[PDB]
Swiss-Prot record, chain A:
Gene: S
Protein name (record): Spike protein S1
Subunit-level organization: Binds to host ACE2. RBD also interacts with the N-linked glycan on 'Asn-90' of ACE2. Cleavage of S generates a polybasic C-terminal sequence on S1 that binds to host Neuropilin-1 (NRP1) and Neuropilin-2 (NRP2) receptors. Interacts with host integrin alpha-5/beta-1 (ITGA5:ITGB1) and with ACE2 in complex with integrin alpha-5/beta-1 (ITGA5:ITGB1). May interact via cytoplasmic c-terminus with M protein. May interact (via N-terminus) with host bilirubin and biliverdin, thereby preventing antibody binding to the SARS-CoV-2 spike NTD via an allosteric mechanism.
Residues of the full protein shown: 163 to 202 of 1273
Record organism: Severe acute respiratory syndrome coronavirus 2
Glycosylation sites: N3
Lineage: Viruses, Riboviria, Orthornavirae, Pisuviricota, Pisoniviricetes
Domain of life: Viruses
Amino acid sequence: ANNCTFEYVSQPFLMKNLREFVFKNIDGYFK
Amino acid sequence: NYLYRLLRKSKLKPFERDISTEIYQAGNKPCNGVAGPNCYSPLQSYGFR
């Protein structure tokens, strides 16, 4: 469906309920 | 069938691709989607003989 490059299916991601995230894009990687 | 690019607005960080083809402009007058004066297509073939 319009140049499907990558797929990813894994464990549930979103589970006095403060949550924190950090996204960084370094040398061709997403962490 | 095998293509490559001349020029881009900025340098490439390692390990990525550029797929979309946009007509670059290097002047005050915009290209407006027309490859006329001061407008060049980015991709052309190798032409192997």
